[PDB]
Structure 1
Amino acid sequence: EIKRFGRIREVIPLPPLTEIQVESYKKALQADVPPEKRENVGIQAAFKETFPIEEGDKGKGGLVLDFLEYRIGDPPFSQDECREKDLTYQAPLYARLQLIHKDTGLIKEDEVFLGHLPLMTEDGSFIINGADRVIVSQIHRSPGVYFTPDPARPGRYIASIIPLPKRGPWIDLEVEASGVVTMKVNKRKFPLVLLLRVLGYDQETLVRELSAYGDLVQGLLDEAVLAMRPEEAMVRLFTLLRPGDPPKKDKALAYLFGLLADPKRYDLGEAGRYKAEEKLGVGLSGRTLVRFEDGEFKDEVFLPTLRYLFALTAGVPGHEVDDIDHLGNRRIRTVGELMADQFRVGLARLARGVRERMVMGSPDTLTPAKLVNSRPLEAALREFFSRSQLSQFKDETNPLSSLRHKRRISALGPGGLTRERAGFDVRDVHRTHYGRICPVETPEGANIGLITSLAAYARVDALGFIRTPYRRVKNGVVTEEVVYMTASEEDRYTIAQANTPLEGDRIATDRVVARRRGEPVIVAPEEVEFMDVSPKQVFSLNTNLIPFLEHDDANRALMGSNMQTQAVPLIRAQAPVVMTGLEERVVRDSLAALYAEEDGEVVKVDGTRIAVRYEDGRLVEHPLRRYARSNQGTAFDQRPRVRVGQRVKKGDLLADGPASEEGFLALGQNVLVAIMPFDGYNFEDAIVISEELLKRDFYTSIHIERYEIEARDTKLGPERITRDIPHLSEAALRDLDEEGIVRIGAEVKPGDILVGRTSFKGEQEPSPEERLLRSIFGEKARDVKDTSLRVPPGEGGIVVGRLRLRRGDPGVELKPGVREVVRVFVAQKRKLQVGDKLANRHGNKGVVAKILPVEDMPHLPDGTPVDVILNPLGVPSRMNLGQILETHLGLAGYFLGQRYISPVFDGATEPEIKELLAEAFNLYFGKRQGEGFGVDKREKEVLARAEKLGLVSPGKSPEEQLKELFDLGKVVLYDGRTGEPFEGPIVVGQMFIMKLYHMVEDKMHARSTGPYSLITQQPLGGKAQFGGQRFGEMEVWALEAYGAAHTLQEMLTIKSDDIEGRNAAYQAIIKGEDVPEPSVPESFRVLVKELQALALDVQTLDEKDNPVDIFEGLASK
């Protein structure tokens, strides 16, 4: 059965969790959208901005290119096809433009081909270079005007302005304390009355609106300048701000024009114009500062920002300082905004590719056919999707991984902030944050608060203003209005909580929870204005999957969430028997599962393909991808859960997912858990387990790895993938099918070749001993040498994927000078080993310490032993009670088996679970009563000892006492070693855990003697690079602190890069002798010669002041 819980009932479900990536990108798509009627913004803005292109006026050479549509469609290859090809998933985009001569007035229209622009896949993750990647959302303070208290002046106030990043300069209204006012932009200081020159103002209008506020007149007045006129004093600051070029007149009408009036160089987001407009209490249309009207420049922006600034500084109410980190003042860069922006500037590079090319030439043969380029645009957009900070490897570690990852936002990147500049207020959580971004979930490293994750119900409009759903109310009336009230708008009304005294759709108790701006205040049935849909919105995805989360401290909660990201697939995976009930749309919106699109009936199961002929009469099927490799090597599988045939409704799940249990996310398992200090093996957040599960293969998964090799043609001539090797014995040639590659289903130890390759080594005369060695056996010197591709240590198992495409094959392109390439998957079943990372939803980590045999184990009177027995230490220090309550509900619930839905902040409580305990116990004591048993003497003993501290209420019979004890969460356990009970009760039950990504089978590495770096002979690093650890500066220091002189010396010399040191060492130990003393570390010698390149005379002396030769006979010239 499934029983579930909670008081507050969600009035509306969660809008799709995949849209913030898909929809906000889709807005800049305009795919199906007609070529004529379009949105003018997004990708269409990227066109209308860079168009129309023109050089001339009516004159000798004129040219004008004007914009028409960019055919969307024709994807070259489907997702899967692109992924195996290493090609980007993309599609041709077709721009139709007209080339009109200024002179003849002859319109010559031509449609051209821009290039291949990557298109979005289904779940919202693009495929670039054959690899699934993702664009993480970006965040920055929304464009507009702002007002803060003067950082310099004690009581004064300063203003600021700014558009899209780099797409306009900063502006500041600061009053330096002269009593006069100096505006400052891009490192310079000039009077506020300076810029008013061409602004269309003079001595008059200035004092018209100057004194309308207060004492502010004088500082805004000047004499030595103001006598001048717009085109006269125009050259003043132009002479100043740019000494680089000669201060002409005509060039003061140009260089300044592009700064503001140019819509393309000042381009200001539709949101910036918006918010700043309704902010200053004025109106505007153009996204520029001032328009270019017929010579001089008119005014729109400056007058209002002056009005509001001077107002605020005067102290007239309603004009306040706009909050800095406030969500109402900060927008979100989404996929569409980003891609479209990059399209704008990249296509501007292409605009250079247009205006410049059309005059070197003859207007005779002319058409955008020859005038249009690709690489500036195509490679700009190619650059955005890879090298940028906001685009990286998709999180395929699990479905919920990519989900959450796509729902994460970073203030970092190109035009946000950077690591070097961050304060407290930067990564902090603003008062009005609330139901918008997750207050906890964030990397526990130096990125805490740096990368926040999106909340549940919170949305993002095209304006970047985040809007959290609320609920309107008029005097105790619950309205069906779902209010998306803006952050800035949220600060206005009075907002209650979802936990409000809900009864009879009316207000129950007088005093009610509520707030303004984030300030808690008790309210009355009248002043009630808004409410909350559900507390769910106050957190993110993973954070919402934690039951009784109100009992866990924020730290460990955070850890629990990001660890839910760290989760891996499980073959037998079992969804939490106690969850928050959110897992339904978790598997739906993840798009990792297969459902019924409409009403229909199953025909055939066939774990390859499930064919279901729908009620609509048409024959449709939905095949399945079974056991496919992901980015993290985490296995992707979909298990058909429907019989040979039956009829299903629309939305019913016909197939599982990498972790999906009957339409529920299954991370780990709910297996029996005990809590006690067991032989100190669980010491300090350590774990312990039982072999029993290893039999049942509870946590065991499948991991796949990507193997590849290039056939590249050498300067001595080409290589190839073949089955021949000169010296290879028949033994190693086994698994190769017929052509020199490993077949499907063959086990490979981590010595074993997958793909063989053959080359020819450069010709060098064998050393004398080698010459003779070659002579005795007469071994042919086969000019072909083995290039074969082996497998790394620790990675071994069977083989599934085998794909090889040579040069010239259908739908493939290779590198310039390569012949073939081979790619093989290696699949391996990994059972959970000793030392692996495991953790729960409540944020308690650990590693496996010594799995105990099924024999010995703290069983119960039913003889059922436990599976973990986790130590009770990390609980009080790290303060998480959620795992405790979860374990109790699992205690009473294992007997019942029914599920538990405990939504965050609303769910099971002490009385409920108490009744569950009493219930399960009644039926348990029943279980032993009719089966011919009674109270165990050992249990009598434990109850007696517990009765001393009042753990069980005295005077009551041991039956009732065990009822109480069992109710407390703890029962009687018998040591599986001795058979004797334990001095006191031990809380046990069913609790949810997880098998973390980090696996000892991988992380573990060692090297004796490997290769070295080219520059300096210092050994390599990394694992697959086969390299040793480095000894840090602090390591060195500690080593000195011990006072081990030689250990340190050998470390820095013989043991690391020393010239003959390492060699003579290997010699020594190989011969059993003792390693001699080293001479030069050899990184040192490099240092010396570097200093020589700096003409630093490097003189190494000796016991008394004499040149020592550090380089033996080396440079004596």
Structure 2
Amino acid sequence: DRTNPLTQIVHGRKLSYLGPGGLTGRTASFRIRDIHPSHYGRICPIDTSEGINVGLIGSLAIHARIGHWGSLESPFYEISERSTGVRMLYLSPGRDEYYMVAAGNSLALNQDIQEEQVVPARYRQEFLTIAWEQVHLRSIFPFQYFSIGASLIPFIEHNDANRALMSSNMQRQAVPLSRSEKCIVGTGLERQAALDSGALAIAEREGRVVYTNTDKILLAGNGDILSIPLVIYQRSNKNTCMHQKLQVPRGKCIKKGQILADGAATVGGELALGKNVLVAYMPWEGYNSEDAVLISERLVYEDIYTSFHIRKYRNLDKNGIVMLGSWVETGDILVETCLKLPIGGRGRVIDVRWIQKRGGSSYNPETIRVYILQKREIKVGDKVAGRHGNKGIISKILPRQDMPYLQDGRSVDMVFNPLGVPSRMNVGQIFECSLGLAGSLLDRHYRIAPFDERYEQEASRKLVFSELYEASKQTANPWVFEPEYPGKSRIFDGRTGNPFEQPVIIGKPYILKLIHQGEMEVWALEGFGVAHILQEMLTY
């Protein structure tokens, strides 16, 4: 799946219970689908393929490997008074059960030796609180229990697991846009994701860059010159353009493993699947009664959510093939006898290749492959989704003058419905919005590791409010952090210019663009009593 660099790395980490010599869909009992205490740190508890094949398709954890016996193992840290005292051991699922595994901090002192203090531990597939003298192993990695999709969700401690699964599913359905931008608030794993994606040109040798060009890059090391090609507007397997940009000037030194050229949906070596937009949470004339978004018109003429799509199949030449640069329309033929573009497909023919020789062991000119490019601007009906499970369908586009504006005088880009927040149980989105606004005002980017409450209680609140107040005091914008209601600000109406009677949430979240834009009917028609309509439908 070459939709985005994320599907390329999350597709190989899948585990399938079904297959040759495996349990079927309906034959599998209900006890197989539920989570087991042995799956900790080895199989992701969040990632699950929805549908009839639920619980049978799972994702492998980050810190997991095969243990020479077809068994998946997880790292653990010894905290026993031994000769070495520190050794990251890989434990088989059967051997780890016999040790005391505790995931807790040592920041506690109650007038004792610090070893008599209690800590939640896991022993014999059961949870219990024991002293610090009885613990043998200790899990210290943050991303040890989650997969790639669940880890890319910032502030995951404040959301439910169902919305985590929804976000992990929606992140796969992301479209690489024309220009990419890094997220202000991230988890810190986008770097390794872009590294292991494969769309980034990494240096295989050390040396200076002596020649930079759009088609190739020349790297000169110890006399030898290495030529590196560059992908320029290629087609993926699911109609997605692939392009690579340069990020190193000419005449600088490089080492093996450092980036020479960028890639699609990546900027600066980090995954970039969306843009930062100013968002307010409020009801607006019922356009967002359901899950729906009322976006501003700035996203249309500023080339924010513009994407490219490449599909394969008077303008006809002498031989009959459509020449390069032709603008085909719905109904135009290019080569029944002549292939015609279907409804909804129109764009520039970038290149045509004649498959005179098939490779199917014969030279089959069954047809000549043609490629069209369609730059799809963001329009009504498109689905925009965040990294916390929030999903919305665009309902209306309004001009810049009709959108609500803040006290600084800037019009909001998107308007979301607030009633969904308590319905789907997502709290991390508010933290993300506030921290993104603070970072945009302070010109900073944040990369936070999950479960920051282990350091102290209410750590995320402090992290967000401190940055908000710093942005409010460095730049003279008191509306950013108001003491009466921190995180909320008063906005105005765009039509009448009157303030609303209640403050609203203001922030800059990271919004992604999604790719996706019988007998019961007969029973219903018989219940209504429309016999002629049913007869006509059956005859049709």
Name the TM-score, length of structure 1 as normaliser.
0.46
For 2:523 and 2:235, how far apart are their aligned partners in 1? 45
Match of 1:1047 among 528, 533, 537: 533
Whether 2:322 is the aligned partner of 1:742: answer yes
For 2:490 and 2:339, how far apart are their aligned partners in 1? 58
Query: Are the aligned partners of 1:684 and 1:873 in contact in 2 as well (CA < 8 Å)?
Result: no
For 2:68 and 2:285, how far apart are their aligned partners in 1? 59
- The 1:812/1:433 distance shift into structure 2, 3 A limit, reads closer
Match of 2:483 in 1: 964
Query: Are the aligned partners of 1:685 and 1:873 in contact in 2 as well (CA < 8 Å)?
Result: no
Query: Are the aligned partners of 2:406 and 2:491 in contact in 1 as well (CA < 8 Å)?
Result: yes
Whether 2:354 is the aligned partner of 1:804: answer yes
Match of 1:686 in 2: 292
Match of 1:1038 in 2: 524
Match of 1:866 in 2: 412
Superposition deviation, residue 910 in structure 1 = 0.8
Whether 2:277 is the aligned partner of 1:671: answer yes
Q: Deviations over 1:389-422 (max 9, x none)?
A: xxxxxx1111110211111111011111111212
* RMSD between aligned residues: 2.3
Whether 2:47 is the aligned partner of 1:501: answer no
Match of 2:375 in 1: 829
Query: Are the aligned partners of 2:163 and 2:388 in contact in 1 as well (CA < 8 Å)?
Result: yes
- The 1:570/1:805 distance shift into structure 2, 3 A limit, reads same
Match of 1:978 among 485, 489, 496: 496
Q: Deviations over 1:102-158 (max 9, x none)?
A: xxxxxxxxxxxxxxxxxxxxxxxxxxxxxxxxxxxxxxxxxxxxxxxxxxxxxxxxx
For 1:834 and 1:573, how far apart are their aligned partners in 2? 22
User: What amino acid maps onto 1:501 in structure 2?
Assistant: S
SS in 1 for 2:396: coil
User: What amino acid maps onto 1:978 in structure 2?
Assistant: T
Whether 2:340 is the aligned partner of 1:790: answer yes
Match of 1:521 among 113, 124, 128: 128
- The 1:820/1:605 distance shift into structure 2, 3 A limit, reads same
Superposition deviation, residue 533 in structure 1 = 3.0
Q: Structure 1 stretches of 5 or more lacking a match?
A: 1-394, 708-733, 756-785, 928-958, 1000-1031, 1057-1117
SS in 1 for 2:217: strand
For 1:651 and 1:509, how far apart are their aligned partners in 2? 47
SS in 2 for 1:689: strand
* Residue pairs, 1:544-583, within 5 angstroms: 544-583=151-190
- The 1:637/1:502 distance shift into structure 2, 3 A limit, reads farther
For 1:483 and 1:558, how far apart are their aligned partners in 2? 30
For 2:493 and 2:263, how far apart are their aligned partners in 1? 40
* Residue pairs, 1:1048-1067, within 5 angstroms: 1048-1053=534-539, 1056=540
* Residue pairs, 1:279-298, within 5 angstroms: none
User: What amino acid maps onto 1:547 in structure 2?
Assistant: P
Q: Deviations over 1:189-221 (max 9, x none)?
A: xxxxxxxxxxxxxxxxxxxxxxxxxxxxxxxxx
Superposition deviation, residue 523 in structure 1 = 2.1
- The 1:476/1:883 distance shift into structure 2, 3 A limit, reads farther
Superposition deviation, residue 969 in structure 1 = 1.3
* Residue pairs, 1:455-604, within 5 angstroms: 455-475=61-81, 479-497=85-103, 499-501=104-106, 510-604=117-211
Query: Are the aligned partners of 1:432 and 1:517 in contact in 2 as well (CA < 8 Å)?
Result: no
User: What amino acid maps onto 2:106 in structure 1?
Assistant: P
User: What amino acid maps onto 2:393 in structure 1?
Assistant: V
**Identity score, percent:** 47
- The 1:475/1:512 distance shift into structure 2, 3 A limit, reads farther
- The 1:787/1:463 distance shift into structure 2, 3 A limit, reads same
Query: Are the aligned partners of 1:476 and 1:525 in contact in 2 as well (CA < 8 Å)?
Result: no
User: What amino acid maps onto 2:91 in structure 1?
Assistant: M
Query: Are the aligned partners of 2:480 and 2:487 in contact in 1 as well (CA < 8 Å)?
Result: no
Superposition deviation, residue 501 in structure 1 = 2.5
Query: Are the aligned partners of 2:481 and 2:487 in contact in 1 as well (CA < 8 Å)?
Result: no
Query: Are the aligned partners of 1:686 and 1:847 in contact in 2 as well (CA < 8 Å)?
Result: yes
Whether 2:451 is the aligned partner of 1:905: answer yes
Query: Are the aligned partners of 2:472 and 2:480 in contact in 1 as well (CA < 8 Å)?
Result: no
Superposition deviation, residue 613 in structure 1 = 1.6
* Residue pairs, 1:159-178, within 5 angstroms: none
Match of 2:474 in 1: 923
Superposition deviation, residue 528 in structure 1 = 1.7
For 1:501 and 1:896, how far apart are their aligned partners in 2? 34
Query: Are the aligned partners of 1:501 and 1:508 in contact in 2 as well (CA < 8 Å)?
Result: no
Match of 2:361 in 1: 813
Query: Are the aligned partners of 2:349 and 2:373 in contact in 1 as well (CA < 8 Å)?
Result: yes
Match of 2:506 in 1: 988
User: What amino acid maps onto 2:447 in structure 1?
Assistant: I
User: What amino acid maps onto 1:635 in structure 2?
Assistant: C
User: What amino acid maps onto 2:343 in structure 1?
Assistant: P
SS in 1 for 2:129: coil
Superposition deviation, residue 651 in structure 1 = 2.4
- The 1:644/1:745 distance shift into structure 2, 3 A limit, reads farther
Whether 2:262 is the aligned partner of 1:656: answer yes
Whether 2:461 is the aligned partner of 1:914: answer no
Match of 2:250 in 1: 644
Q: Deviations over 1:1-38 (max 9, x none)?
A: xxxxxxxxxxxxxxxxxxxxxxxxxxxxxxxxxxxxxx
For 1:892 and 1:749, how far apart are their aligned partners in 2? 47
SS in 2 for 1:743: coil
Q: Deviations over 1:77-102 (max 9, x none)?
A: xxxxxxxxxxxxxxxxxxxxxxxxxx
Superposition deviation, residue 565 in structure 1 = 0.9
For 2:83 and 2:171, how far apart are their aligned partners in 1? 39
SS in 2 for 1:912: helix
Q: Structure 2 stretches of 5 or more lacking a match?
A: 454-458
Query: Are the aligned partners of 1:671 and 1:991 in contact in 2 as well (CA < 8 Å)?
Result: yes
Q: Deviations over 1:1023-1072 (max 9, x none)?
A: xxxxxxxxx1101111122212211121112xx1xxxxxxxxxxxxxxxx
- The 1:612/1:680 distance shift into structure 2, 3 A limit, reads same
For 1:397 and 1:962, how far apart are their aligned partners in 2? 39
For 1:487 and 1:961, how far apart are their aligned partners in 2? 50
Match of 1:116 in 2: none
Match of 1:628 among 215, 234, 244: 234
For 1:568 and 1:992, how far apart are their aligned partners in 2? 14
Whether 2:432 is the aligned partner of 1:886: answer yes
Judging by fraction of residues, say which structure has more strand.
2
User: What amino acid maps onto 1:788 in structure 2?
Assistant: C
For 2:500 and 2:479, how far apart are their aligned partners in 1? 19
Query: Are the aligned partners of 1:563 and 1:996 in contact in 2 as well (CA < 8 Å)?
Result: yes
SS in 2 for 1:424: coil
For 1:667 and 1:964, how far apart are their aligned partners in 2? 34
SS in 2 for 1:705: strand
Query: Are the aligned partners of 2:480 and 2:489 in contact in 1 as well (CA < 8 Å)?
Result: no
Judging by fraction of residues, say which structure has more helix.
1
SS in 2 for 1:919: helix
Q: Which has the higher contact order (CA 8 A, sep 6+)?
A: 2
Match of 1:877 in 2: 423
Superposition deviation, residue 617 in structure 1 = 2.7
* Residue pairs, 1:385-464, within 5 angstroms: 395-464=1-70
For 2:394 and 2:220, how far apart are their aligned partners in 1? 48
- The 1:547/1:820 distance shift into structure 2, 3 A limit, reads closer
Query: Are the aligned partners of 1:476 and 1:528 in contact in 2 as well (CA < 8 Å)?
Result: no
Superposition deviation, residue 502 in structure 1 = 6.2
User: What amino acid maps onto 2:345 in structure 1?
Assistant: E
For 1:600 and 1:799, how far apart are their aligned partners in 2? 39
- The 1:823/1:839 distance shift into structure 2, 3 A limit, reads same
Match of 1:38 in 2: none
For 1:456 and 1:597, how far apart are their aligned partners in 2? 26
- The 1:669/1:477 distance shift into structure 2, 3 A limit, reads farther
* Residue pairs, 1:599-610, within 5 angstroms: 599-610=206-217
- The 1:799/1:819 distance shift into structure 2, 3 A limit, reads closer
Query: Are the aligned partners of 1:883 and 1:991 in contact in 2 as well (CA < 8 Å)?
Result: yes
For 1:688 and 1:464, how far apart are their aligned partners in 2? 51
